[PDB]
Amino acid sequence: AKSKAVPFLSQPEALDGSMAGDVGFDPFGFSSNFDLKWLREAELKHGRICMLAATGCLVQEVVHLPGEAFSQKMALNAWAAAPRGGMISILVAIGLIELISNRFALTATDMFANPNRVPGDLGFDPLSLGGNGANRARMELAEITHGRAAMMGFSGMVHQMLVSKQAPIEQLMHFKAV
Amino acid sequence: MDSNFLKYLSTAPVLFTVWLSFTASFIIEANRFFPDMLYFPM
Amino acid sequence: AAVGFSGVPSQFGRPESGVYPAEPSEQTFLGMRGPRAPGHRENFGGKHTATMLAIAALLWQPVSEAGMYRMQGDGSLTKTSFNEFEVPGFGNAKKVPTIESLFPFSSKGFDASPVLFGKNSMIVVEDPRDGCGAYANSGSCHTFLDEIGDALKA
Amino acid sequence: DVAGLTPCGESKEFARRLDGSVKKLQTRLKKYEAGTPPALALQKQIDKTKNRFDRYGKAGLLCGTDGLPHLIADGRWSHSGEFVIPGLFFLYVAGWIGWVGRSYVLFARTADKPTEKEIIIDVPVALSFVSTGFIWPFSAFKEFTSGNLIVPADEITVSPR
Amino acid sequence: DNAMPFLEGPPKLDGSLAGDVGFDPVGFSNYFDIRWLREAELKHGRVCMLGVTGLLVQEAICLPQFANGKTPVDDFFVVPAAGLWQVFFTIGAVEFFSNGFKLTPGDMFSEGREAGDLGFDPLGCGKNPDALARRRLVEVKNGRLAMIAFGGMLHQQLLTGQGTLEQLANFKAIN
Amino acid sequence: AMSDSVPFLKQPEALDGSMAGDVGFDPLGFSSIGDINFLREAELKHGRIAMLAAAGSIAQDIFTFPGVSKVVGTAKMTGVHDILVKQGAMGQLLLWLSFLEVFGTIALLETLDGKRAPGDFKFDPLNFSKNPETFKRYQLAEIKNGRLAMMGVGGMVHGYFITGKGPLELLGNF
Amino acid sequence: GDFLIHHAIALALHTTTLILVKGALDARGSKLMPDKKDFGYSFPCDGPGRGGTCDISAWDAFYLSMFWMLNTIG
Amino acid sequence: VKRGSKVRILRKESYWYQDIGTVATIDTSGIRYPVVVRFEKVSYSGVNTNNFSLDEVVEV
Amino acid sequence: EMSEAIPFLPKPANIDASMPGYSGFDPLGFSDYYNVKWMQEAEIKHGRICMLAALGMMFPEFGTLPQFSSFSTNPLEAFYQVGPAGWGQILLFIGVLESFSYEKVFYGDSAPGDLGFDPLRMSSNAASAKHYARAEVMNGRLAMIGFSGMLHHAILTKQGPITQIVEQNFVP
Ligand code: CLA
C-alpha cells in the first residue's frame, strides 16, 4: 500500500505497475488530478526531445557542418550563429510533424479520442525494430530510462553552459570552479 | 491535502486573484528584463 | 466524470466524431503506421519507398555535378554553369531556367558532391580533448578530475 | 519620411529630449556621494534612459517636431511592427482566452449543477481547456463550419417586436 | 527467361509484347497502363532512331539554305527560330492527327487501339504476320539501342565539341 | 538451449543454425532487434566489399595500372581517394556501384518480403556450386573469408593511418 | 493628439447612438417588459418586481442619452 | 406532446420564448392553459414553471 | 468511409466523386457550411483567372506587343504603366464576360463553370470530357499556387519570374 520509490508515502492510485518505468513515484499526486495517458505522452515527448538535445549538445561540439555559421562549439552560441531562416524552417517543420503525427488530434480534449491510440505510440517504427513480443516491455523501459536520464543531463548541460560559458566536453577538459 | 480546502481554493475569487497576480507577475518580469518595448522589433 | 487531460471529447462536452478507424499493423519505411485506403501499403509500402529513395540517390549524382563540361585543347575540362546556356527561339528570354535553377548549389556557395558533402563543403571534425589526458596534466589542461584532486590535496 | 516625419536617430529634438532627461537625472545625482545607494540607483536610471533613447533611435521609429516617436498604422510593411504585429499577438491571445472560456462554459452545461461549476472551477478540466487554446483559429473555424458555433435564430430567445 | 534472376517476375509482363525479357525491376507496369508505357517506349525509340540518323547526317550534309554549325548539336542553334517553331508545330499537328485528337492516358486507348500502331504502313510491309512479329522485335530493340546511342552521341558531342565520326577518328581523352 | 560459441549464454532465438557460419554467436542480441535477413544481407555485403578492398590494398601495394602513377604520384591507400575525387575515377565508380545498388535495394526488399535468400543474386556464371554440398562448403568459405577480410581491411587501413606505408610495405618495414 | 480626440469623439458618438437606438428599438417591449407599448413612451417604472425596473421606458433612454450628448459636444 | 417531453415555447411575451422546457403535466379538464412546463432557467421573478396552451408549445 | 486526401479523417459529406476535381480534401469542412456548387463555380473561376495570370506574369519576358515594347518587364511596374484608358477597356471587357456569369450563376441551373464556351467541342468524347473536366480544375489550382508565388516573388525582387530565376535572386 506504500510507494516503492518513496516508502513513507502511500501508493498513488492509477499507478499499478502497468506502464514502463512505473515504480510508484508520484508524490505530488499529478496522476490523481490528470489523466495518465496525457502525462505519459508528455513524458515520452520531453524525454525524446531531450535525448536528441543531449546528443546534440555533445556531438555539435565535436562535429560541425561546413561554414562559419555552424562553427560554434558551444550550443547556446550555435543557437544564435546558425542562419535564422533555417531555424524558422526547423520550427515550421516541427509544427507540421506535430500536426500530422498526432493525426489532427493535438489537444487535451481530442488526443486519445480514438481508443486505439496508445500514449507515446505515434505509429513510428521506420525500420520495424519492434517486431518482437517479449522484447517490447524491456524496450519501453529502456526508452523511458534513456528519456529520463536525457532530461536530467540536458537540463544540467544547458545551465552549466550558462555558468561556465564553455561547451560541455571542453568544460570537462578545462574546468574552472565558481 | 484536504479536498474541502482544495475546493475552497478552486472558488472564483481565489482563482481570480491568483490568476491575475500570476498574469501581472508575467507582465512585470517581462518589463523588468525587456523594458521600454513600444514596438515589435523587426 | 471528466478526468483532467483525458482527451475524450465526450467527457468535455466537445463535438466528437463517432467514427474512429481501427489501427492496422502495416508499416512503411519512410511513412507512418495508420489507416490507409485498400491497396495503399501494397503499392506504396516499404518496397516502393526504398526503391524511390535509391533512384533519387542515383539521380542526385549527375544533378549534384550539374554543368556544361567542355573539353579544351589540352584535354582538360572546363565546367561552366547552365545559366549561360542560351536558346535560339524564345524572344528576349535567351537565358532560360535549367536544372541548376531547381538545384542552385553555387548560389549558396555549397560545393555539392554525389555523396552530398564535397571537398570545399567537407564535414568539419575536431578533437575536443585538446591533446591532453583525463588526469595528471601539467600545462593548459585542467580537467574536472584534476580539479577534484587539487580540491582534495590542499 | 512618412507624413513629413523624420527618423528619430537624426531628429535634433529627440536628442534634446534625451539630453534634458539625462541632465534632470544628473542634477539629482550631484547631491549624493559616490558609492551611496541613491547614487547607484540614479546612475542606473541614467543608463536605462540612455539605452532606451539609443534603442528608439536605432529602431527606424519616426519622430515629429515634438521630439517623440510617432507610430504609423496604415498597413505599410515598413511600420508593421508598430501596430500590426502587436495586433496579431493580441488577437492570438484574446482568441485563446475566448475559445477556452467558451469550451469551459459548454463543459459546465453538461455537469450535474452547472452554476456550481461556474463558481467553483473544476481546475484540472479548466487547465485542460486552457491547454487546448493554442490552435484556437482552426478549432474555432471547424466548430463554425460544422454548425457547432452558431445556433439558429429559432432557438434563441427574443423580445416581442 | 528473366532478365533479373534474383527478383520475382513482374506479374503484368506476360511475354505477349515483343521485347519482353521480363525486365521491370522498379515495377513500372505495376502502376501504369502497359499500353501507355509501350506507346511511350516506341515513340522515344523512333524519335531516337531518327535522331541518331540526324546526328550522323548533319555532321556531313548541310542544306544550302542553312549555315552549318561546328557540331550537329550546335546545328540546332544556327537555325532561324521561326523554322524551329514551324517544325515544332508540324510535329504537334502530326501528334494531334495520328492519335485522333486523343492525346492523354485517359482517352488515348479508349477505342481499343494498339500501342505504337498509328496506322502508318505505306509501303506494304505488314501482310506477313511471321515477318510482322520479327519486325516488332527488331523495331523495339533498335529503338532502345538508338535511345542509348543517341544519349551517348549527344553527350559526347557536347563534351568534346566535335562530331560523332569526327570523334571516332582522332580520339582525344579527358586529362 | 545455450550458445555453442559462448557456452554460458543462451542461444539467440532468431539464430537457428541454417545459415552458413551460424555458431550461435549473438551475445548482445542484435538479431532480436533487426531482421535476420537484413542482418545477413548486410553481413554479406560488408564481407564481399571488404574482400575486394583487402585484395585491392594488397594488389595496389604490388602494382599499379598504366598511367595511374602519373596522376597519383607516391600516394597509397585512402590517400588516393581525394586525388581520384578531383579526377573522374571515384565519381564513375560511385555512379556504377549506385546503379548496381538500386537493384540491390530491390533485392533486399524482396528478401525482406521473403522471396529471396539474403545475398543470393544468383551470380554463378561458371557453375561452381553444382552439388548442394559444394554449395554449403562455398557458403561457409564465403562467410568466413568475408568476416576475416572485414577484420583484415580494418587493420590495413588503420595501419596506414598510423604509418602511411601500406599493408605489404609495413610487413617489409617493421 | 488629433488622432486620440477624434477616436474619443467616435466613442462618444457610438455610445450616444447605442443609448438612443436601444431606447427606440426596445420602446415597444423587452424581455423585462414585453407589453411596454401599452404603457406609452414615458412612464416612471414598472415597480420593484421582476428584479426592479427603474428607468425602463424609452423616455428614460432619452434622459440617459442627454448626458452623453452633453459629454460629446463638450 | 406528453409528460416528460422536451418542448419549445411559442408564446411571444414569455420569458422562455423559443427556449426549451420539460412538460410536467397535461391537464385533461377544460383549462385554457393545460400544459405545465418546467424550465431550467429562472425568470426575472424567480419562477421556473408556467402553464401554456397546446398551440404555444412545439415538441422538439 | 474515409477521405482519400487525408486517410485518417472521415470523408466529407457534401463533396462527391462526381465533382471534377474531387480528392476528398476538406479538412476545415467548408462544404459542410457553404453552398457547394457556389464553391465549385468560384474555384473554377479563381483557377481560370490564375491560369491566364500565371501565363501573363511570364509572357512579357519572352516578348511584348509592339505598342507596349517600352513597358517594364516587372509585372508590378507594367501594371501601373498601362494608362487608365487601357485598364478601363480591360475592365469593360471583363464586365461583358462576367455578365454571362452573372446570368448563369444567379438565374440558371447549369453545371459549375459552364458558360457555354466549347467551340471546338472537345467534351464530345466522354473519356476526353472527364479528363478535361479534372484537368481544368487541376491546372487551375496549380496556377493559383503559381501566381501566388509569382506575385510575392515579384514584390520581393521587382523583376519577372524568368529574370529572377536566371539572375538567381533567391534571397530577400
Ligand atoms: C503551307 C506550307 C508552308 C509554307 C508556305 C512555308 C513557308 C515558309 N517556310 Mg516552312 N515548313 C513547312 C510548311 C510551309 N512553310 C512545314 C510543313 C515544315 C516542317 C517539315 C516547314 C519547316 C520550315 C523550316 C525549318 C523553315 C521554314 C521556313 C519557311 C519560310 C522561308 C522564307 C523565309 O525565311 O522568310 C521568312 C522570314 C521571316 C523572318 C518570317 C518568319 C517566318 C514566318 C513566320 C513564316 C510563316 C509560315 C506560315 C505560317 C506557313 C507555315 C505553316 C506551318 C504549319 C509550318 C517560308 C515563309 C524557314 C524560316 O522560317 O526562316 C525564317 C525555315 O528555316 N519552314
Ligand code: CLA
Ligand atoms: C533537440 C535537437 C537538436 C536541436 C534543436 C539542434 C539545433 C542545432 N544544431 Mg544540431 N544535432 C542534434 C540535435 C539538435 N541540434 C543531434 C542529435 C545531432 C547529431 C546527429 C546534431 C548534429 C549537428 C551538427 C553536426 C550540426 C548541428 C547544428 C545545429 C544548429 C543549426 C541547425 C542544423 O544545421 O542542424 C543540423 C542537424 C543535424 C545534423 C541532425 C538533426 C537531427 C534531429 C535530431 C532530428 C531527428 C528527429 C526528427 C524530428 C524526426 C522525428 C519525427 C518523429 C518523432 C515523428 C542548431 C543550433 C550545426 C551547428 O550550428 O554546429 C554547431 C552543425 O554543424 N547539429
Ligand code: CLA
Ligand atoms: C467565456 C468568456 C466570454 C466569451 C467568449 C464572450 C464572448 C463575447 N462577449 Mg462577453 N462577457 C464575458 C465573458 C465572455 N464573453 C464576461 C465574463 C462578461 C462580464 C464582464 C462579459 C460582458 C460582455 C459585454 C458587456 C459585451 C460582451 C460582448 C461579447 C461578444 C464580443 C466579444 C467582446 O466584446 O469581448 C469583450 C469581453 C469583455 C470585455 C468581458 C470579458 C471578461 C473576461 C476577460 C472574459 C472571461 C474569461 C473567463 C474567466 C475564462 C474562464 C475559462 C476557464 C474557466 C477555463 C462575444 C459574443 C459584447 C457584445 O455583445 O458584442 C456583440 C458586449 O457588449 N460581453
Ligand code: CLA
Ligand atoms: C559502357 C559504360 C561506360 C561508359 C560509357 C563510361 C565512360 C567513361 N568512364 Mg567509366 N566505368 C564504367 C562504365 C562506363 N564508363 C564501369 C562499369 C566502371 C567500373 C565501375 C567504370 C569506371 C571508371 C573509372 C574508374 C574511370 C572511368 C572514366 C570514364 C570516362 C573516360 C573518358 C575518356 O576519355 O576515356 C577514354 C578511354 C578509353 C577509350 C579507353 C579505356 C579502356 C579501359 C582502360 C579498359 C578498362 C577495362 C576494365 C578493366 C573492364 C571493366 C570490368 C569491371 C566492371 C570489373 C568516361 C566518361 C574515367 C574518368 O572519369 O576520367 C575522367 C575514370 O577514371 N570509368
Ligand SMILES: CC1=C(C#C/C(C)=C/C=C/C(C)=C/C=C/C=C(C)/C=C/C=C(\C)C#CC2=C(C)C[C@@H](O)CC2(C)C)C(C)(C)C[C@H](O)C1
Ligand atoms: C563467385 C563468383 C566469382 C568469384 C568472385 C570473387 C572475385 C572472389 C575473389 C575474392 C577475394 C577478394 C577474397 C579475398 C579475401 C581477403 C582476405 C580474407 C583478407 C585477408 C586479410 C588478413 C589475412 C590480413 C591483413 C594483414 C594485416 C591486417 C595488415 C597488413 O600489414 C598485413 C596483413 C595483410 C597480413 C567467380 C569469378 C569465381 C565466378 C563464379 O561463378 C561467381
Ligand SMILES: CC1=C(C#C/C(C)=C/C=C/C(C)=C/C=C/C=C(C)/C=C/C=C(\C)C#CC2=C(C)C[C@@H](O)CC2(C)C)C(C)(C)C[C@H](O)C1
Ligand atoms: C476553353 C477551351 C479552349 C480555351 C483555352 C485556354 C486558352 C486554355 C489555355 C490555358 C493556360 C492559360 C493554362 C495555364 C496554366 C498555368 C499554370 C498551370 C502554370 C503554373 C505555374 C506554377 C506551377 C509555377 C511557377 C513557379 C513560380 C511560382 C516560381 C518560379 O521560381 C518557378 C516556377 C516558374 C516553376 C479552346 C480555345 C482550345 C477551345 C475549346 O473548345 C474550349
Ligand SMILES: CC1=C(C#C\C(C)=C/C=C/C(C)=C/C=C/C=C(C)/C=C/C=C(\C)C#CC2=C(C)C[C@@H](O)CC2(C)C)C(C)(C)C[C@H](O)C1
Ligand atoms: C525508434 C527507432 C528509431 C531510433 C531512434 C533515435 C535516433 C534513437 C537515439 C536515442 C538516442 C538519442 C539516445 C540518447 C541518449 C542520451 C541520454 C541517455 C543522456 C545524457 C547523459 C547525461 C547523464 C549527462 C550529461 C552530463 C552533464 C549533465 C554534465 C557534464 O559535466 C557531464 C555529462 C555530459 C556526462 C530509428 C530511427 C532507428 C528507426 C527505428 O525503426 C525506430
